[PDB]
Amino acid sequence: FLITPKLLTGLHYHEKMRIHCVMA
Amino acid sequence: PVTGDATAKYLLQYILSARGICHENALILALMRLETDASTLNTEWSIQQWVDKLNDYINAINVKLNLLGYKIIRINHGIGRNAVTLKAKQNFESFEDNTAIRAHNNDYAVLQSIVLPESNRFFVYVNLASTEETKLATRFNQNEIEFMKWAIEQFMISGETIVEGPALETSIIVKEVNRILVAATGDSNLAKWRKFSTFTVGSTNLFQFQELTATDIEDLLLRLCELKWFYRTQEGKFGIDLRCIAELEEYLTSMYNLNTCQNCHKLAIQGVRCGNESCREENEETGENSLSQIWHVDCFKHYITHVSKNCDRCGSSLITEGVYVI
Amino acid sequence: KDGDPQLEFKVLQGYRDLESEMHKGRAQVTRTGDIGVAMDNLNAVDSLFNKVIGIKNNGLFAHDARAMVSISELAQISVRNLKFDADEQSAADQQEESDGDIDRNEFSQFNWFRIGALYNTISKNAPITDHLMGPLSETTPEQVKKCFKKLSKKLGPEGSINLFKFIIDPNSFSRSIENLFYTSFLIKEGKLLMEHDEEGLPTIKIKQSISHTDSRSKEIERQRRRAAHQNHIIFQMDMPTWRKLIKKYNITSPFLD
Amino acid sequence: SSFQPGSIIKIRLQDFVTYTLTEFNLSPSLNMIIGPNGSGKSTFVCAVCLGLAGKPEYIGRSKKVEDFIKNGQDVSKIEITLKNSPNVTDIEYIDARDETIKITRIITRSKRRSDY
Ligand SMILES: [Zn+2]
Helix, strand or coil: CCCECCCCCCCCCCCCCCCCCCCC | CHHHHHHHHHHHHHHHHCCCEEEHHHHHHHHHHHHHHHCCCCCCCCHHHHHHHHHHHHHHHHHHHHHCCEEEEEEECCCHHHHHHHHHHHHHHHHHHHHCCCCCCHHHHHHHHCCCCCCCEEEEEEECCCCHHHHCCCCCCHHHHHHHHHHHHHHHHHHHCCEECCCCCCCHHHHHHHHHHHHHHCCCCCCCCCEEECCCCCHHHHCCCCCCCHHHHHHHHHHHHHCCCEEECCCCCEEECHHHHHHHHHHHHHHHCCCCCCCCCCCCCCEEEECCHHHHCCECCCCECCCCCEECHHHHHHHHHHCCCECCCCCCECCCCEEEEC | CCCCHHHHHHHHHHHHHHHHHHHHHHHHHHHCCCCHHHHHHHHHHHHHHHHHCCCCCHHHHHHHHHHHHHHHHHHHHHHHHHHCCCHHHHHHHHHHHHCCCCCCCCCCHHHHHHHHHHHHHHCCCCCCCCCCECCECCCHHHHHHHHHHHHHHHHCCCCCEEHHHHHCCCCCHHHHHHHHHHHHHHHCCCCCEEEECCCCCEEEECCCCCCCCCHHHHHHHHHHHHHCCCEEECCCCCHHHHHHHHHHHCCCCCCCC | CCCCCCEECCEEEEEECCEEEEEEECCCCCCCCECCCCCCHHHHHHHHHHCCCCCHHHCCCCCCHHHHECCCCCEEEEEEEEECCCCCCCECCECCCCCEEEEEEEEECCCCCCEC
């Protein structure tokens, strides 16, 4: 778990991961 | 002679405090140092005469050296007599200032009075052999070699790839390039090319080797720097030392098809090559990537002073079709 | 004598000059060992403190104590040197000290310079050398509003479109991720809702954004919409999963250009 | 367990600050939860901490648990479901054999500390 306010471009991704988005 | 023999001894001894590599002029100063220790000095000699007997001794030396699978060569520093002598007289100024405390003798006055003729030559007692004891340098462990060889390869790659952009005037190399250009042509505003290359980058990749801790890394680097195998740019980049070069010079020449100077036909990793890619194109008769013809800086200066301003492989406008080489 | 700034600072100055002169006698004693320096510095500092009597600034006391410590060491060393007319103990410091030119208690530059030089100059060990041959072998809200505007345009106020058919951009995984980014960060504003279609596929429809004239009222409305029962369906969206959604919900065109 | 130890499952919040009800179907793989506050993401972290025997003062946004209930509500519900690890043993309704454990903390406004 990692809580961030914003997100940036150029995010090399993979399969085992699971990107989230905290809504508040 | 025994006098000369012991001389040459002491020379090599300095060379050991020179850790194997000694300046022409520093050698001269040592000569005068020795003649003061010998009190045999005859004032009547131009610096050239001292150089003469120096080299006579040198030949006797390298006679035996060749007997030993080790040898001293005299080369000229690629940054050239003028830039070499600029940095060296920056310290001959620090030297005569320090010796004024010791200039209680007319000998010391003559020493400070002899302005050093500009010279970039050094002498190097270097291995000629590869056998058991040789790999038995005992300097340190094996990883340190393998990784350093890798870094050398990285520097080779860096040298090969040309980077285009404004010249780093922070590099004195560019400064002296322009100074020579003005001296020869008188064109105070002659347009500079933006094509250049060097090996010195890769310190960032010193820290990219992952098989050992960073500490040990740095420390080995400090050894080398002390051991003057590679060298630190004030920008943080690192190249490989001139004497270290001569060693690897020959090995890498074998390993990578390394083109030498065109006038002195010696490999130089700094100087001026042709910025025309056709001069750096492969000589299609060989199938080998033919790096652009490049003289030693002095070799280039003499050529342009006496031969041409156009390439011979390609003939290009070396005024505009050049490449600075660092 | 209780609070004259001039007296205090002149005491400071005299004591600093006293420190300099005591450093001079430091080297004097190291070469020779004089006690008069110690005693006279003691007298000087005591007299100045007598002037400081009634004056009550801490720094003066601190520096005076420094003087006290220095003078006591001066006297003790001078007595030791007085008792008889050790020498190496004197010499090594002097060796260190004479290798201490400096401008005029850590380890100096030429200390070790001289020492190593001496040994080299004298070592019967010959020097050595080495070598290598052989060892040589738009900001966030703008994109948010753009994507959500495209979503609302292609969605309709009550029209329902299955979730993947909208979130997925089949032409680019990165653009699909950016589109989902923008969509979620406008879902915070509250102009769209998600329901379930007849087949159970999550279909988004436009949640009619209640027109609030006051910005604070609109913000409170957004907070309440966020406070609604949040059916939080979290799925990992990678290129294999993204193409799986493409194939599952029959997504052919970028919903959010 | 089949999943990694302490794997969380969907968490149900009820009558919390503003959230009268909500349920988060969490993810055992990864959580790159990006987004600022405005509905109480820090308050969400406080809820997670307090509902799992954690003092809210680790961050310090709000202290008293009974005040975490939604305004106008005196009882809030926090159901945090965890894939029980074999490590958790010899505790009430807790064994290595246990698969899923649902910690339902009931926060009462008349109680400073909630009843797990
Ligand atoms: Zn050419």
